[PDB]
């Protein structure tokens, strides 16, 4: 995703699903290659100690001054018509300048953005339609002209453009913080299990203090862990052992 040869236009932002692997987030938050590295409802350091069912890496390209529009509850052309984040977004946004790659002598026009739409996008909605936008009261019938415009437009990416107008590559990491079995964990190593003692336990990011005992609960093959009346964890399934 980060080392990708080519990126997608913001209107047709690519999505890569990450599952069933170990994520060494250090390589990102220790690297100096990134201008913007903004994590919402999560600290990157702690990601090493966490598991998730799925991760979504949404990749695209924008101009610099619009990078601020990649954030929860922002407005503008990008966040309205191209790529909308939810207000309760939990994840990271990484962005770095790509003037050396995405800009060329004479102007790179391969990268587009949606300029018109009848309504704002929903979070993680993808609109790749090319319908003629009816700006006025007259039906276009797929014919361009007065108040009938093509919804997309190119970015003017030249190496001499202002940093504001220079191309920036963007990657958005969203995590599936659901309670379900987690296939995307951090590098943190595991240890042996101690029973019948007061211990500080961490199971797949689920932290706590207590005494771990062999249970008699009739857990189902799929059930990961249990709760009591108070909405507190009461019993778990060993990630390494059934």
């Amino acid at each position, epitope marked *: 995703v980060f080392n990708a040869t080519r990126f997608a236009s913001v209107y047709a932002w690519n999505r890569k699903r990450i599952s069933n692997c170990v994520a060494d987030y250090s390589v990102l938050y220790n690297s100096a290659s990134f201008s913007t590295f903004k994590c919402y409802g999560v600290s990157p350091t702690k990601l090493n100690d966490l598991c998730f069912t799925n991760v979504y890496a949404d990749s695209f390209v924008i101009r610099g001054d619009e990078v601020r529009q990649i954030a929860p509850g922002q407005t503008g052309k990008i966040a309205d018509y191209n790529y909308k984040l939810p207000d309760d977004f939990t994840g990271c946004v990484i962005a770095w300048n790509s003037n050396n790659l995405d800009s060329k002598v004479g102007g790179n*026009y*391969n990268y587009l953005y949606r300029l018109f739409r009848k309504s704002n996008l929903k979070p993680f909605e993808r609109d790749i339609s*090319t319908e003629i936008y009816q700006a006025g009261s007259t039906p276009c019938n797929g014919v*361009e*002209g007065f108040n009938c*415009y093509f919804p997309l437009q*190119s970015y003017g990416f030249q190496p001499t453009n202002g940093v504001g107008y220079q191309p920036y590559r963007v990657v958005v990491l969203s995590f599936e913080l659901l309670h379900a079995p987690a296939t995307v964990c951090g590098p943190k190593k595991s240890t042996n299990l101690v029973k019948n003692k007061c211990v500080n336990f961490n199971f797949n990011g689920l932290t706590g203090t207590g005494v771990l005992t062999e249970s008699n609960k009739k857990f189902l093959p799929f059930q990961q862990f249990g709760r009591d009346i108070a909405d507190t964890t009461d019993a778990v399934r060993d990630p390494q052992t059934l």
Partner: nanobody
Amino acid sequence: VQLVESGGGLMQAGGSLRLSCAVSGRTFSTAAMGWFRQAPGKEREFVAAIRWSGGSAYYADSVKGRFTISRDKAKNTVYLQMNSLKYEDTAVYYCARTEYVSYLLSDYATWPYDYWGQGTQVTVSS
């Protein structure tokens, strides 16, 4: 990337000719194709443009009702059907291509294009 023009040549006034322009080489994307013309000693002048997506066309006033621009996406070819030829139509005709997508079709009349064909002579006789 090359633009290879063909067709045209000599035709008597009132007749019809078709110009072709084939795009060869690896293209990332095409936004629009256009035809321009240059009569001897005169400035090169816009004739017609077509958006690759959707196929909406924009015409110079001088050719409206007479010329039709069309596109075959699969063949990566643009055509100019030149009907009701007049002496005024005598010129070298140039194919042009751009990857620049404007929301506004009329921009293709004045946009500086990135790629140009070699030019094809059209001569209209009496």
